[PDB]
Ligand binder design. Structure first.
Ligand SMILES: [Mg+2]
Ligand SMILES: [Mg+2]
Ligand SMILES: [Mg+2]
Ligand SMILES: [Mg+2]
Ligand SMILES: [Mg+2]
Ligand SMILES: [Mg+2]
Ligand SMILES: [Mg+2]
Ligand SMILES: [Mg+2]
Ligand SMILES: [Mg+2]
Ligand SMILES: [Mg+2]
Ligand SMILES: [Mg+2]
Ligand SMILES: [Mg+2]
Ligand SMILES: [Mg+2]
Ligand SMILES: [Mg+2]
Ligand SMILES: [Mg+2]
Ligand SMILES: [Mg+2]
Ligand SMILES: [Mg+2]
Ligand SMILES: [Mg+2]
Ligand SMILES: [Mg+2]
Ligand SMILES: [Mg+2]
Ligand SMILES: [Mg+2]
Ligand SMILES: [Mg+2]
Ligand SMILES: [Mg+2]
Ligand SMILES: [Mg+2]
Ligand SMILES: [Mg+2]
Ligand SMILES: [Mg+2]
Ligand SMILES: [Mg+2]
Ligand SMILES: [Mg+2]
Ligand SMILES: [Mg+2]
Ligand SMILES: [Mg+2]
Ligand SMILES: [Mg+2]
Ligand SMILES: [Mg+2]
Ligand SMILES: [Mg+2]
Ligand SMILES: [Mg+2]
Ligand SMILES: [Mg+2]
Ligand SMILES: [Mg+2]
Ligand SMILES: [Mg+2]
Ligand SMILES: [Mg+2]
Ligand SMILES: [Mg+2]
Ligand SMILES: [Mg+2]
Ligand SMILES: [Mg+2]
Ligand SMILES: [Mg+2]
Ligand SMILES: [Mg+2]
Ligand SMILES: [Mg+2]
Ligand SMILES: [Mg+2]
Ligand SMILES: [Mg+2]
Ligand SMILES: [Mg+2]
Ligand SMILES: [Mg+2]
Ligand SMILES: [Mg+2]
Ligand SMILES: [Mg+2]
Ligand SMILES: [Mg+2]
Ligand SMILES: [Mg+2]
Ligand SMILES: [Mg+2]
Ligand SMILES: [Mg+2]
Ligand SMILES: [Mg+2]
Ligand SMILES: [Mg+2]
Ligand SMILES: [Mg+2]
Ligand SMILES: [Mg+2]
Ligand SMILES: [Mg+2]
Ligand SMILES: [Mg+2]
Ligand SMILES: [Mg+2]
Lengths: 64, 145, 118, 204
RNA sequence: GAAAGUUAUAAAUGAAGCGGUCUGGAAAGGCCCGCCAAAGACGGUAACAGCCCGGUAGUUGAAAUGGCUUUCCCUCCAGAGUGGAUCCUGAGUACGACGGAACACGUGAAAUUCCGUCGGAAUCCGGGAGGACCAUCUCCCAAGGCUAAAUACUCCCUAGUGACCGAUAGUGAACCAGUACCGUGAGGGAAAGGUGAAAAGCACCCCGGAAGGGGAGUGAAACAGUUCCUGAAACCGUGUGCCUACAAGUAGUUAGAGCCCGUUAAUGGGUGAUAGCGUGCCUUUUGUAGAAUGAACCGGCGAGUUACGAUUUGUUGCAAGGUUAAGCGGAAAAAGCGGAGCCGUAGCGAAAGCGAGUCUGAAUAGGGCGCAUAAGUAACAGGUCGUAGACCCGAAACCAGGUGAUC
RNA sequence: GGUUCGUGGUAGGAGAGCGUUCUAAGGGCGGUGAAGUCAGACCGGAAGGACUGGUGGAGCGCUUAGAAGUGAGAAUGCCG
């Protein structure tokens, strides 16, 4: 049978035009009185999956 | 010549068989090491497992939604349209007639990458602002279908 | 297609028992005991090609020594004189002269004795 | 290009074959690949063995796990038992596979143009027999020097050509649209009528 | 219910070499000559047969019974338009509340279908659906029933096929096999093929109660004689060339006299008084001669495979393009047809959307991702991964249907 | 074909090969004796391959490719 796509990763990962994976920062839910404005202003941006993590999660999102 | 068949060199290789003696380097343990979870038959962990540490996908948030009414257009640039003859009435039927456009998903949109020299009369559903301007600079005429 | 293991296992095993010919008891009859006796014999023969060169030089040296002491010399003084004078004969042939042609061994011992005296 | 012969074995003029079909440079690497695929698509693959779950018996543990002094065992149909099941073995399976359609066309042209460089192709005015007669086919087959295995390609001909050559051992007759790389390569010479040459060039 | 045709269930006919010669127990084999073929499939015959036998291709054949097709007989039958007063169009039903289930959909914003219990419509000026719901529009008439083919399987019968097995294999069972045997019972469940072409299976004599032998005879062979083709290793013996009763040994290896032989003929073979060196194999370990583990010995059997997907490398074809799937066709072929679909050729954004740019932002700022700075695709082979028992053997335990108070 | 530098090795990576069963084509030997089995003082760098002789009494190699039920000394392994 054709292998299945990780549905929990397809809801929060995104493929760029060079094959890389793009994500969002993960410390922005509810404790905004404990983080400075410099932190908050930079955690609302996006980031890239590092090389170490990419090698472990290639096959989970192969078909988008 | 059925007795002198010679396949192309490098196109075929002999497979590797493990567990067939210690003179080949893949003997006793067959390339597996010594006494772990990965040395057992059917052993191994999930694709994204990290041994109890929270997986990467579970410490970043989800984002967005999917639009049901999403429109995706078939894209043709200016360079491809230069293959026509002067004065030709360029039509989406003509685009699929030649086979340059395989499927018109929701329509045809002309973008402005490249250059156009022929004076054409193109028709489609959508035009980019630069593409429409460029065609009008060569004595063209764009009418939106 | 099925490949039954015939005619190949016996040919290889019998070739080892033949090499164990002359061994005591089951070491020349049974494969497992004869297999590890053949490997050991190869290991003993490998390093005995190294000691065979050591064993003979000790025999030549202890034999040139005996003949040199009959000329009021030791082996060490004889060897120093020969190298000092320039004679380049090795131990295998100096021992040959000491047994078969003792007359010429005294000729070489005279050259060694003179070189040690200027 | 080629001298044209009659059924009686006499010269009857000359015929020119298409240079894009019978005159290309053969691609030997392509022909080998198509031959291998065409041989591998001919085998049935009807073979099977019984696992440890298909041999009758088993289930009951042969003896107590501890205390008896024997080795631990779980079934009498285990792979290492005398009547036990096979571990992996064969299984029913298909072997057929097919190359891209353009590669298959280039292999037919190459094998059919190599038979011209080797002077092993015989163009013929027309082959027909009033009644099936295996004796007459042998007499025909010696008027033209072959003396070995051959492939007879006839388009119009008749039904008497196949009947009168069926009993011969190294002779095979095909109706000019069944031509294939394996059949052409399996034989030495290639006798083809003029009408069959026209149909072959039409396809490719 | 008849007739005609076809088919299944027994069958008939059917070409061509006693060809010569050699070896041989025996010719189908070697050498030298002929012939048949719509028949050179298969099997047998004293070794390998197109021309010796049964047959094969082709052509014929059915009293009787079953099947199929057609026709006859037989049986049964109203279908068009115009009006629309008035009447009919499936009731404890559709729905709703409560509790469950099926829907890919776990009560969720939950449409749709079904079950149990309560409440409970309209009926053509009517009713339902279009994923809560309302209005418009579009499509359609629930609460009655029937329906062939395209699809799934093989205890069976006929004809065949296999880069399937060949007696520890292949069905548990090639042999009087679900038998012998084991259990109160449900139930579990084996081992065991081969004389020879032909029994021509040893008349007769001798030892012996017999068994069993030695001759004679049959046979190509009896060292093929009733587990009988071939007959390995462990294991048990008889004869003999060299050594051995003052010696401390993982049994060998290196040096070596003496004695005895004579080869795939070459700085050859067997045995060895004496001298030097030398604590088995595997596994598991920081580390094993290990007083840690496994193996009495010999033989056979016994462990990374396959299908479908992902990714990378190699090879081949075409190349801004590459390629068909199911299917039709056919010989369990090869073409041909089939462009539906898939990957690539453009990205950015949650999305509307814009587009070689786009998003964030008040910004023409800066920055992120892209283009500039373009090679993909189809098929096969190698490595690795995913779903499958997935590398082989091994639990104590859990659940479901049954059999047991002859102890 | 030369010059220089190298060539201990466990887990492990890479490469080249030997041998077994079956298939296809070419070419072969065999009752003047096939496979198997027994012995030998031969050949190759290894896995391995010939030759001669005894037994046996009917099948079997070689070359180039292809496909695997592919090679055992150990599992208190199964059977004899
Ligand atoms: Mg928030
Ligand atoms: Mg390899
Ligand atoms: Mg190694
Ligand atoms: Mg091992
Ligand atoms: Mg281990
Ligand atoms: Mg490990
Ligand atoms: Mg076999
Ligand atoms: Mg074996
Ligand atoms: Mg000895
Ligand atoms: Mg079972
Ligand atoms: Mg059970
Ligand atoms: Mg079995
Ligand atoms: Mg007859
Ligand atoms: Mg006849
Ligand atoms: Mg004779
Ligand atoms: Mg004859
Ligand atoms: Mg035959
Ligand atoms: Mg015979
Ligand atoms: Mg026979
Ligand atoms: Mg409810
Ligand atoms: Mg209800
Ligand atoms: Mg309504
Ligand atoms: Mg809908
Ligand atoms: Mg709606
Ligand atoms: Mg119904
Ligand atoms: Mg059996
Ligand atoms: Mg047998
Ligand atoms: Mg009983
Ligand atoms: Mg008798
Ligand atoms: Mg008697
Ligand atoms: Mg007798
Ligand atoms: Mg006789
Ligand atoms: Mg026989
Ligand atoms: Mg016997
Ligand atoms: Mg014996
Ligand atoms: Mg003493
Ligand atoms: Mg003594
Ligand atoms: Mg001591
Ligand atoms: Mg000693
Ligand atoms: Mg010792
Ligand atoms: Mg162990
Ligand atoms: Mg320890
Ligand atoms: Mg232990
Ligand atoms: Mg023990
Ligand atoms: Mg043992
Ligand atoms: Mg694996
Ligand atoms: Mg390519
Ligand atoms: Mg069909
Ligand atoms: Mg077919
Ligand atoms: Mg997107
Ligand atoms: Mg920018
Ligand atoms: Mg904004
Ligand atoms: Mg009871
Ligand atoms: Mg090394
Ligand atoms: Mg070194
Ligand atoms: Mg490797
Ligand atoms: Mg064989
Ligand atoms: Mg022999
Ligand atoms: Mg095996
Ligand atoms: Mg081993
Ligand atoms: Mg054993």
């Amino acid at each position: 049978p054709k292998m299945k796509t990780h549905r929990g990763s397809a809801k929060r990962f995104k493929r760029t035009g060079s094959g890389k994976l793009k994500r969002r920062h993960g410390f922005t839910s509810h404790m905004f009185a404990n983080k400075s404005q410099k932190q908050k202003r930079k955690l609302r941006k996006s980031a890239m999956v590092s090389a170490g993590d990419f090698k472990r999660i290639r096959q989970m999102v192969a078909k988008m | 010549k059925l007795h002198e068949l010679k396949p192309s060199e490098g196109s075929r290789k002999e497979r590797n068989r493990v567990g067939r003696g210690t003179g080949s380097g893949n003997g006793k343990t067959s390339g597996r090491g010594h006494k772990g979870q990965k040395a057992r038959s059917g052993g191994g962990v999930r694709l994204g497992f990290e041994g109890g540490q929270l997986p990467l996908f579970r410490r970043i948030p989800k984002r967005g939604f999917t639009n049901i009414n999403r429109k995706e257009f078939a894209i043709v640039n200016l360079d491809v349209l230069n293959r026509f003859e002067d004065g030709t009435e360029v039509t989406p039927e003509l685009l699929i007639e030649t086979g340059i456009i395989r499927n018109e998903k929701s329509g045809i949109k002309i973008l402005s990458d490249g250059n156009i020299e022929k004076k054409l009369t193109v028709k489609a559903n959508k035009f980019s602002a630069a593409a429409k301007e460029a065609i009008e600079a060569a004595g063209g005429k764009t009418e939106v279908i | 297609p099925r490949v039954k293991g015939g005619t190949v296992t016996r040919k290889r095993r019998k070739k080892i028992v033949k090499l164990a010919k002359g061994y005591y008891g089951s070491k020349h009859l049974l494969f497992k005991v004869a297999n590890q006796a053949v490997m050991k014999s190869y290991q003993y023969a490998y390093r005995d090609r190294r000691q065979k060169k050591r064993d003979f030089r000790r025999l030549w040296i202890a034999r040139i020594n005996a003949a040199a002491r009959m000329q009021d010399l030791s082996y060490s003084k004889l060897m120093h004189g020969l190298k000092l004078a320039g004679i380049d004969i090795n131990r295998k042939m100096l021992a040959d002269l000491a047994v078969n042609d003792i007359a010429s061994f005294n000729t070489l011992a005279d050259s060694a004795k003179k070189a040690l005296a200027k | 290009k080629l001298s044209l012969l009659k059924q009686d074995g006499t010269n009857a003029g000359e015929i020119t074959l298409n240079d894009t079909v019978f005159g290309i440079e053969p691609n030997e690497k392509v022909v080998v690949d198509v031959i291998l695929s065409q041989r591998a698509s001919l085998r049935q693959g009807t073979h099977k063995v019984k696992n440890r779950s298909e041999v009758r018996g088993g289930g009951r543990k042969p003896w107590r796990q501890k205390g008896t002094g024997r080795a631990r065992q779980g079934s009498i149909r285990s792979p290492q038992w005398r009547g036990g099941g096979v571990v992996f073995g064969p299984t029913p399976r298909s072997y057929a596979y097919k190359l891209p359609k353009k590669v298959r066309r280039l292999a037919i042209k190459s094998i059919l143009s190599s038979k011209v460089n080797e002077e092993k192709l015989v163009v013929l005015e027309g082959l027909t027999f009033d009644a099936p007669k295996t004796k007459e086919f042998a007499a025909f087959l010696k008027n033209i020097s072959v003396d070995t295995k051959a492939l007879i390609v006839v388009a119009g001909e008749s039904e008497n050509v196949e009947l009168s050559a069926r009993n011969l051992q190294g002779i095979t007759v095909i109706p000019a649209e069944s031509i294939s790389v394996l059949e052409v390569a399996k034989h030495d010479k290639l006798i083809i009528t003029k009408a069959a040459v026209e149909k072959v060039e039409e396809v490719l």
